[PDB]
Amino acid sequence: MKSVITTVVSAADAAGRFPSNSDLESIQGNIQRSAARLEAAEKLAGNHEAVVKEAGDACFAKYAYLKNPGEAGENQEKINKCYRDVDHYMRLVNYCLVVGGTGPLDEWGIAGAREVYRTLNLPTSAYVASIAYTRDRLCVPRDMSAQAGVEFSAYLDYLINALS
Amino acid sequence: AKKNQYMGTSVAPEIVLTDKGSDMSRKVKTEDKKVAADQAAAMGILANMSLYASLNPVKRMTYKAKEQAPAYVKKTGNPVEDFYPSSWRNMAPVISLSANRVAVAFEKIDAASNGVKANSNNKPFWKSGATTKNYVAPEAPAQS
Amino acid sequence: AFSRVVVNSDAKAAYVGGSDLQALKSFIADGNKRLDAVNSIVSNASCMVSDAVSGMICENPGLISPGGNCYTNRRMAACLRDGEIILRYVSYALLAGDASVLEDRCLNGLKETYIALGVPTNSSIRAVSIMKAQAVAFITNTATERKMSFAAGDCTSLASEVASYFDRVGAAIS
Amino acid sequence: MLDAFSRVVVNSDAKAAYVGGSDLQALKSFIADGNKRLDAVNSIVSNASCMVSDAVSGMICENPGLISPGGNCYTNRRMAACLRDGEIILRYVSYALLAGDASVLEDRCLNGLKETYIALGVPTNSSIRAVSIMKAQAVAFITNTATERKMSFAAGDCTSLASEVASYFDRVGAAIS
Amino acid sequence: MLDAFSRVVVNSDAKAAYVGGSDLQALKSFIADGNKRLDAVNSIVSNASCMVSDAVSGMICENPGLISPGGNCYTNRRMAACLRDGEIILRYVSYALLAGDASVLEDRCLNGLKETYIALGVPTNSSIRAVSIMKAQAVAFITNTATERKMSFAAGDCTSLASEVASYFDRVGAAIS
Amino acid sequence: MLDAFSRVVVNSDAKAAYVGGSDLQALKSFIADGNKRLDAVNSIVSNASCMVSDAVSGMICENPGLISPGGNCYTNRRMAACLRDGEIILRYVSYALLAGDASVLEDRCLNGLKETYIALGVPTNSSIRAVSIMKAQAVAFITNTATERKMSFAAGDCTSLASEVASYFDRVGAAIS
Amino acid sequence: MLDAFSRVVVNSDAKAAYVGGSDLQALKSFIADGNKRLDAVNSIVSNASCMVSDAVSGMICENPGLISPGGNCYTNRRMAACLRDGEIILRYVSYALLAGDASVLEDRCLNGLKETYIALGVPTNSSIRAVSIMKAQAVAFITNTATERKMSFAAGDCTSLASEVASYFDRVGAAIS
Ligand SMILES: C=CC1=C(C)[C@@H](Cc2[nH]c(/C=C3N=C(/C=C4\NC(=O)[C@H](C)[C@H]4CC)C(C)=C\3CCC(=O)O)c(CCC(=O)O)c2C)NC1=O
Ligand SMILES: C=CC1=C(C)[C@@H](Cc2[nH]c(/C=C3N=C(/C=C4\NC(=O)[C@H](C)[C@H]4CC)C(C)=C\3CCC(=O)O)c(CCC(=O)O)c2C)NC1=O
Ligand SMILES: C=CC1=C(C)[C@@H](Cc2[nH]c(/C=C3N=C(/C=C4\NC(=O)[C@H](C)[C@H]4CC)C(C)=C\3CCC(=O)O)c(CCC(=O)O)c2C)NC1=O
Ligand SMILES: C=CC1=C(C)[C@@H](Cc2[nH]c(/C=C3N=C(/C=C4\NC(=O)[C@H](C)[C@H]4CC)C(C)=C\3CCC(=O)O)c(CCC(=O)O)c2C)NC1=O
Ligand SMILES: C=CC1=C(C)[C@@H](Cc2[nH]c(/C=C3N=C(/C=C4\NC(=O)[C@H](C)[C@H]4CC)C(C)=C\3CCC(=O)O)c(CCC(=O)O)c2C)NC1=O
Ligand SMILES: C=CC1=C(C)[C@@H](Cc2[nH]c(/C=C3N=C(/C=C4\NC(=O)[C@H](C)[C@H]4CC)C(C)=C\3CCC(=O)O)c(CCC(=O)O)c2C)NC1=O
Ligand SMILES: C=CC1=C(C)[C@@H](Cc2[nH]c(/C=C3N=C(/C=C4\NC(=O)[C@H](C)[C@H]4CC)C(C)=C\3CCC(=O)O)c(CCC(=O)O)c2C)NC1=O
Ligand SMILES: C=CC1=C(C)[C@@H](Cc2[nH]c(/C=C3N=C(/C=C4\NC(=O)[C@H](C)[C@H]4CC)C(C)=C\3CCC(=O)O)c(CCC(=O)O)c2C)NC1=O
Ligand SMILES: C=CC1=C(C)[C@@H](Cc2[nH]c(/C=C3N=C(/C=C4\NC(=O)[C@H](C)[C@H]4CC)C(C)=C\3CCC(=O)O)c(CCC(=O)O)c2C)NC1=O
Ligand SMILES: C=CC1=C(C)[C@@H](Cc2[nH]c(/C=C3N=C(/C=C4\NC(=O)[C@H](C)[C@H]4CC)C(C)=C\3CCC(=O)O)c(CCC(=O)O)c2C)NC1=O
Ligand SMILES: C=CC1=C(C)[C@@H](Cc2[nH]c(/C=C3N=C(/C=C4\NC(=O)[C@H](C)[C@H]4CC)C(C)=C\3CCC(=O)O)c(CCC(=O)O)c2C)NC1=O
Ligand SMILES: C=CC1=C(C)[C@@H](Cc2[nH]c(/C=C3N=C(/C=C4\NC(=O)[C@H](C)[C@H]4CC)C(C)=C\3CCC(=O)O)c(CCC(=O)O)c2C)NC1=O
Ligand SMILES: C=CC1=C(C)[C@@H](Cc2[nH]c(/C=C3N=C(/C=C4\NC(=O)[C@H](C)[C@H]4CC)C(C)=C\3CCC(=O)O)c(CCC(=O)O)c2C)NC1=O
Ligand SMILES: C=CC1=C(C)[C@@H](Cc2[nH]c(/C=C3N=C(/C=C4\NC(=O)[C@H](C)[C@H]4CC)C(C)=C\3CCC(=O)O)c(CCC(=O)O)c2C)NC1=O
């Protein structure tokens, strides 16, 4: 993964040396953010089925051509696979808050998404329409923390930049 | 001519002071900005005062609220949809006290026991559906 | 005729800050006792309803039988949800000092739904009277298996307050 | 240079203007006690985001009828519009403390505000009360008697500037009553 | 005038029926908590001249146009009549708290109070503030939530009497509105 | 092979020293809560067949593509051997609990399991889901925490054993992952 | 390579001096405004892809002769390289803003870029206009004055961080000129 612990232990391992004093100031900064980040993971873990229901059909309200014969939302069961396709990306945002870094996104959700979505003819612009809705239907304090709404929104822009 | 042209436009002189300690660093900039109604930070004020006044014992009396009507929802006939609708299904307040914080939260809460979760009736539509061809059982007569 | 968190249409957390608590703690008589009242409950909220439902099983063992209403493991899991949702509204009602939010968002229409869903209403008398008799013993620190450190004094009037709130639940499902 | 800062507010358009280091040094000796007055502006406009966010919430803290069903701070937008005007009132008072003149406070902010609040049905008796909380903050920030936040200032007495910013907040109170 | 026991009599004189035991349990409970009603009356009459001094001068704080020339509380003669009225509303509420019935407050103090205050020209949106500032101060000493002047009571629930006084002070506010 | 009482000996043979008060009191704390230990292995053996009958049904209900052809539980002989594969790995945990040390399952059960599951085409992640339910089924029985079935013991705490089998079921899981 | 703390050490090692207290003045000020720097990098990285696809589209709409056959953005291979020739400029600037020193873009990006570009035939006057547009977008995100997207910060001033990042973009233009 990519987090704060895996980064300083790799550059220690890639230089043949013990954990130095700069390798412990970094994990000190994991203590000063876990109490401002794990409550963003707490809110998303109990409210996911309501935030994926409204973000999933915000793309079908935007791109209404997908419900045509020959398209990506042809029948009902391919619409239900898309809601399953979107409820994975909210699950991995939840894992990046728990780990702290962006490892779970760019190793389970981003890596290889260009080859898959070109082959199976899935428009990535409807993925980023379902993720930009969540980032905006994001009133700050109301839904989450000060940053807890800063942390949660910092990973919803990692998806949009990686799918564009 | 009696009413000034400047009232509803919501502009205001925003003053910025810059000071770095030196003498040649001390500008004041009185420029004009149309200020904007910040929609999102009102919910950090409107909700927190709505639970400040929820927990007042002596401001829920001498400040009594009016009798708000419910919405235009139609009664169907089954009480598990009429009395407990899908917008308020399984919602409950969870109070999370800490040092100098009350922190109630209303979110959909449930179960566990044995594996399954309570809900699994109203799953999301992408989670289930069209797995197998689905048959139906004949009438098993009576017996004696 | 419910209360001021009519925030069921946008935002719900509504926390209360630090110096705004001093606007509240100088406003509530025995406010330090009432903040220690709800903290003795919601810290032990998972152990109570695991013991409240299984106390109902231990006296009425026919619920696990086929035909009973705590077979088919989701239906067991719905009772641990609804054992806790009753406790979750009572702990807000002890904090607010009124039961009007408990009567209108939780107890309203509960009698018609338990006879429609096939819920045995007389066993849920027994499972909530356990949660009455549990939370009396938490708030007076007479819980035998675990005792909580508190400041010295009595909490009798809050113990008589919560016995009225759990009896409102027993009145609403009777 | 001081007359040109009236011209960017008259024109009803975003145009910026400023002072130099030497033009301020000629301004701070033309006006007496001019370093104290710029500390009086900087004590407020560094905390202007907290002063309206306390006074609007302090108005609900003694009157919870404004957030009632039927209240004037309800439907998620009136609360946002209430914070907008208390931001505007704190801008025009602190500009009047910066200018030393209430003549820009009356016709640009308080002219016709009394008729505008009763056209909307804004309760003016609570909007007195949200200004008087902000008046109590402005004499506490200037005299450095604020409890939770003390800014380090050069030493001396600033009692005339606190009474001057008291008197500018009464003109907000006198216009909308 | 009527009290809490006499309203039970004059409701059952209207039905030509003897007062049975099914109507005595609201009255047998009244003499049971009757000591703590008397215990909470003299927390109001012993703090009364500070309550009228606070509730009038806080109404001046919220509405500063009362002391402008042409204001209703302008000169010294009009200022003392406003202090005399808030003592009278406090006197008649503290009869109705003692009697347990709002008969005597209604027909000696509130009888024609609205038509008097229109004819004098007393503002009705400021005079409801002075009965609501002291409404909150009357649920202070019953609930013992006072900032200064803690009073030595006996322990128990008094929120029935705190809610009964808040019924009585809004009976004034529904009469002069 | 060797229990915990003979694990402390073979760690001491390299020391070439007698066993004394440095290393005996943990074995004294073994015996002094030894009545708790075999009180806990009773409530696994008593309901073990219902555990794996729920564990493999819970495995297939989450991933229903194991009974489809191509899944490794398609044939009845693929599903009959799924029980006996999922019964031996539970049986070896019951040896580690009774003997206290996990030396029995690491070599007679787990040595060569990772290489056989990828030789026979057994899906690894499906078994690790099945053994994790047996981890959860155990700790709901050591401490009487399971919902539908409980039994009566002597009043006490047994969290040392419930954290021990949770260390016994992931060394099975790390041998397959 | 050299951040804001490594810069003051190599200038003290030139004199073989200790880093005392008068030279720790900018470094105690670097840390005190440390959250604003992390709030400034977060506003660039979060919308970097829109920042590039708007900068080179804005370069083409001004110079439409870049995409003609014979232009330097003609083919798909040439336009794809321009989309990362200006995405790697924005990357090394955000390294320089994070570290508070320019020794990473001047040692890994700007060194020898001018003769790399005229070996390929890249028009430098249009490469500077693409960088110049990104500089205008960068200061519109440090300061919260972007038209189409507002972000959520605390209250205060970042005109020193806005002008620091505008000085990092000007040495990119001074390198290929
Ligand atoms: C763990 C990470 C993880 C993911 C991110 C997804 C990614 C993903 N999605 C699909 C598969 C799919 N994804 C979609 C999704 C969409 N089509 C649309 O109309 C919209 C553009 C969009 C949702 C709104 C659809 C319709 C399919 C099925 C397409 C097909 O196979 O014919 C597949 C092929 C295998 C499968 O069908 O499941 C994969 C790997 N799956 C994963 O396992
Ligand atoms: C430069 C001109 C200018 C001002 C002087 C202020 C004054 C002002 N406020 C509002 C508009 C408003 N003002 C308030 C304010 C309040 N209501 C309350 O309950 C509180 C006591 C109080 C402040 C906290 C509200 C709630 C609205 C919205 C009214 C509505 O939505 O109906 C309007 C809009 C009227 C219109 O556009 O027709 C104006 C001009 N705002 C400005 O733009
Ligand atoms: C698709 C179908 C399906 C199932 C069969 C269940 C399967 C199931 N049961 C449990 C969980 C459990 N399963 C048992 C097993 C039993 N309970 C008893 O008391 C008996 C002795 C025995 C059944 C005969 C126990 C004791 C627990 C723990 C307590 C509980 O969660 O109820 C778990 C653990 C949750 C997890 O994965 O972490 C799962 C998946 N769930 C499902 O979704
Ligand atoms: C995990 C991350 C996460 C989010 C990003 C949000 C996203 C989000 N917001 C809302 C819900 C809402 N969202 C808003 C939006 C706004 N209010 C305003 O004043 C502005 C105009 C605008 C913010 C820019 C409003 C008013 C509601 C209440 C119901 C509604 O109107 O939709 C809902 C529906 C459920 C609910 O009411 O809570 C969801 C899923 N919620 C989450 O759980
Ligand atoms: C519980 C009910 C409740 C209230 C009664 C009000 C709280 C409140 N605070 C102040 C008073 C004040 N408010 C501030 C403002 C601030 N102080 C800081 O340190 C920050 C920089 C800034 C935003 C928080 C200042 C400086 C004072 C004066 C000194 C003080 O009393 O703290 C006043 C005016 C004078 C007074 O009565 O004390 C009121 C009404 N808000 C509520 O929620
Ligand atoms: C199978 C049969 C079976 C039962 C009949 C019940 C036994 C049981 N225990 C309690 C009673 C209680 N239960 C608790 C709950 C707890 N104590 C703690 O220290 C924990 C924090 C928490 C979860 C264990 C408390 C505090 C009491 C009251 C004091 C006590 O009796 O221990 C009650 C309610 C009081 C009453 O009898 O009315 C019952 C019915 N449990 C069973 O398993
Ligand atoms: C922000 C969160 C928050 C809390 C959780 C409570 C916690 C709390 N309670 C008390 C203080 C107290 N708490 C109790 C309550 C009890 N004591 C008993 O013996 C009973 C068993 C139990 C009743 C439930 C009593 C009797 C006092 C002392 C009197 C009082 O302050 O009310 C104090 C003051 C301690 C001190 O004076 O230093 C605090 C901080 N208050 C808070 O502000
Ligand atoms: C916009 C930029 C800008 C400013 C913010 C001011 C800042 C400022 N004011 C003073 C200097 C001073 N500032 C104060 C002010 C105060 N003393 C108090 O005790 C009160 C709390 C407070 C009044 C409200 C006083 C009394 C002096 C000394 C008299 C004077 O020099 O005018 C000094 C000189 C400090 C020194 O001695 O070196 C400076 C830099 N001037 C500017 O150009
Ligand atoms: C404009 C100037 C201005 C004032 C003069 C005060 C006036 C004032 N005081 C109180 C508030 C109060 N008034 C009293 C009464 C008293 N206090 C004591 O200790 C004595 C026994 C007694 C007379 C001196 C008390 C105890 C409170 C605090 C709230 C309460 O406990 O009722 C309230 C608000 C009541 C409410 O809405 O909840 C107001 C407006 N406030 C102002 O803004
Ligand atoms: C039996 C019950 C009973 C009362 C309630 C009072 C009511 C009352 N007040 C006044 C008379 C008055 N009342 C007020 C009062 C006020 N003006 C304000 O601005 C405030 C809102 C308010 C004080 C809180 C004033 C100012 C006058 C004098 C009017 C004048 O002199 O022009 C008069 C005229 C005759 C007289 O002065 O006696 C009467 C009947 N008297 C009673 O006998
Ligand atoms: C001659 C005039 C006269 C009085 C002043 C009272 C004095 C008084 N009050 C109470 C007695 C009481 N007083 C209270 C009241 C309170 N306790 C609190 O903590 C609350 C703050 C407050 C609520 C308003 C309560 C709860 C009792 C006990 C109930 C009772 O004994 O009747 C008692 C009974 C026993 C005692 O406590 O002494 C007496 C004699 N009676 C009189 O005859
Ligand atoms: C000494 C310790 C010891 C073990 C660990 C097991 C290991 C083991 N498993 C199997 C063999 C097997 N084991 C399984 C079991 C499963 N496959 C799955 O997909 C599920 C994850 C799981 C059921 C829950 C299956 C399906 C076979 C294949 C049997 C066959 O070839 O027909 C075989 C022999 C090959 C065969 O049976 O044909 C052996 C030795 N047996 C032991 O003696
Ligand atoms: C020929 C076609 C053509 C265009 C595409 C635009 C391109 C464009 N945009 C901006 C200017 C800008 N561009 C952005 C960029 C963005 N704003 C956002 O909200 C997104 C996050 C992001 C991608 C859209 C920002 C923030 C500014 C500065 C503020 C603004 O003007 O909006 C500038 C700066 C002017 C300059 O100094 O040269 C130019 C050329 N103009 C054109 O003539
Ligand atoms: C760390 C800093 C760093 C860089 C900036 C680039 C610098 C760079 N750019 C190009 C190469 C190029 N760069 C451009 C870009 C442009 N030409 C234009 O006309 C537009 C003005 C502009 C787009 C913004 C083009 C068109 C090529 C050549 C592509 C080709 O020749 O096929 C090449 C050689 C070809 C290659 O290797 O792909 C190199 C080394 N590399 C680096 O390591």
PDB file of N, CA, C and O in Angstrom, chain A residues 60 65-79:
ATOM      1  N   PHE A  60     -27.266   8.501 -14.493  1.00  0.00           N
ATOM      2  CA  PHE A  60     -28.336   8.145 -15.408  1.00  0.00           C
ATOM      3  C   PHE A  60     -29.271   9.310 -15.670  1.00  0.00           C
ATOM      4  O   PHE A  60     -29.945   9.331 -16.703  1.00  0.00           O
ATOM      5  N   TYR A  65     -28.632   8.423 -22.416  1.00  0.00           N
ATOM      6  CA  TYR A  65     -28.513   7.554 -23.577  1.00  0.00           C
ATOM      7  C   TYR A  65     -28.136   6.135 -23.193  1.00  0.00           C
ATOM      8  O   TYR A  65     -28.269   5.234 -24.020  1.00  0.00           O
ATOM      9  N   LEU A  66     -27.673   5.919 -21.960  1.00  0.00           N
ATOM     10  CA  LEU A  66     -27.147   4.621 -21.562  1.00  0.00           C
ATOM     11  C   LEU A  66     -28.226   3.555 -21.464  1.00  0.00           C
ATOM     12  O   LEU A  66     -27.903   2.368 -21.481  1.00  0.00           O
ATOM     13  N   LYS A  67     -29.495   3.944 -21.408  1.00  0.00           N
ATOM     14  CA  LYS A  67     -30.602   3.000 -21.304  1.00  0.00           C
ATOM     15  C   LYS A  67     -31.205   2.679 -22.663  1.00  0.00           C
ATOM     16  O   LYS A  67     -32.415   2.487 -22.789  1.00  0.00           O
ATOM     17  N   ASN A  68     -30.379   2.635 -23.695  1.00  0.00           N
ATOM     18  CA  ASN A  68     -30.753   2.294 -25.058  1.00  0.00           C
ATOM     19  C   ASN A  68     -30.298   0.885 -25.407  1.00  0.00           C
ATOM     20  O   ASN A  68     -29.387   0.344 -24.776  1.00  0.00           O
ATOM     21  N   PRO A  69     -30.930   0.246 -26.394  1.00  0.00           N
ATOM     22  CA  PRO A  69     -30.422  -1.043 -26.879  1.00  0.00           C
ATOM     23  C   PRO A  69     -29.064  -0.890 -27.544  1.00  0.00           C
ATOM     24  O   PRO A  69     -28.886  -0.073 -28.448  1.00  0.00           O
ATOM     25  N   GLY A  70     -28.103  -1.685 -27.082  1.00  0.00           N
ATOM     26  CA  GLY A  70     -26.735  -1.593 -27.541  1.00  0.00           C
ATOM     27  C   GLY A  70     -25.813  -0.803 -26.641  1.00  0.00           C
ATOM     28  O   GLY A  70     -24.626  -0.678 -26.960  1.00  0.00           O
ATOM     29  N   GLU A  71     -26.315  -0.265 -25.536  1.00  0.00           N
ATOM     30  CA  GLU A  71     -25.543   0.602 -24.666  1.00  0.00           C
ATOM     31  C   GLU A  71     -25.111  -0.151 -23.408  1.00  0.00           C
ATOM     32  O   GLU A  71     -25.270  -1.366 -23.295  1.00  0.00           O
ATOM     33  N   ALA A  72     -24.547   0.581 -22.446  1.00  0.00           N
ATOM     34  CA  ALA A  72     -24.000  -0.038 -21.245  1.00  0.00           C
ATOM     35  C   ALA A  72     -25.050  -0.303 -20.174  1.00  0.00           C
ATOM     36  O   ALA A  72     -24.791  -1.080 -19.253  1.00  0.00           O
ATOM     37  N   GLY A  73     -26.214   0.326 -20.261  1.00  0.00           N
ATOM     38  CA  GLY A  73     -27.296   0.072 -19.331  1.00  0.00           C
ATOM     39  C   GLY A  73     -28.512  -0.478 -20.046  1.00  0.00           C
ATOM     40  O   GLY A  73     -29.627   0.014 -19.836  1.00  0.00           O
ATOM     41  N   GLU A  74     -28.291  -1.459 -20.930  1.00  0.00           N
ATOM     42  CA  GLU A  74     -29.309  -2.069 -21.787  1.00  0.00           C
ATOM     43  C   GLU A  74     -30.504  -2.615 -21.021  1.00  0.00           C
ATOM     44  O   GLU A  74     -31.631  -2.141 -21.191  1.00  0.00           O
ATOM     45  N   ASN A  75     -30.268  -3.604 -20.180  1.00  0.00           N
ATOM     46  CA  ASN A  75     -31.323  -4.226 -19.405  1.00  0.00           C
ATOM     47  C   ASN A  75     -31.223  -3.791 -17.951  1.00  0.00           C
ATOM     48  O   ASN A  75     -30.382  -2.970 -17.580  1.00  0.00           O
ATOM     49  N   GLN A  76     -32.102  -4.354 -17.123  1.00  0.00           N
ATOM     50  CA  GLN A  76     -32.132  -3.999 -15.711  1.00  0.00           C
ATOM     51  C   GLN A  76     -30.932  -4.573 -14.971  1.00  0.00           C
ATOM     52  O   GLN A  76     -30.361  -3.907 -14.103  1.00  0.00           O
ATOM     53  N   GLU A  77     -30.519  -5.795 -15.318  1.00  0.00           N
ATOM     54  CA  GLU A  77     -29.436  -6.432 -14.580  1.00  0.00           C
ATOM     55  C   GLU A  77     -28.079  -5.809 -14.884  1.00  0.00           C
ATOM     56  O   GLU A  77     -27.150  -5.973 -14.087  1.00  0.00           O
ATOM     57  N   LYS A  78     -27.942  -5.099 -16.001  1.00  0.00           N
ATOM     58  CA  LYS A  78     -26.737  -4.317 -16.226  1.00  0.00           C
ATOM     59  C   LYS A  78     -26.812  -2.944 -15.577  1.00  0.00           C
ATOM     60  O   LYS A  78     -25.782  -2.286 -15.424  1.00  0.00           O
ATOM     61  N   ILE A  79     -28.003  -2.485 -15.199  1.00  0.00           N
ATOM     62  CA  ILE A  79     -28.082  -1.309 -14.340  1.00  0.00           C
ATOM     63  C   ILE A  79     -27.659  -1.674 -12.923  1.00  0.00           C
ATOM     64  O   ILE A  79     -26.914  -0.932 -12.270  1.00  0.00           O
TER      65      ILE A  79
END
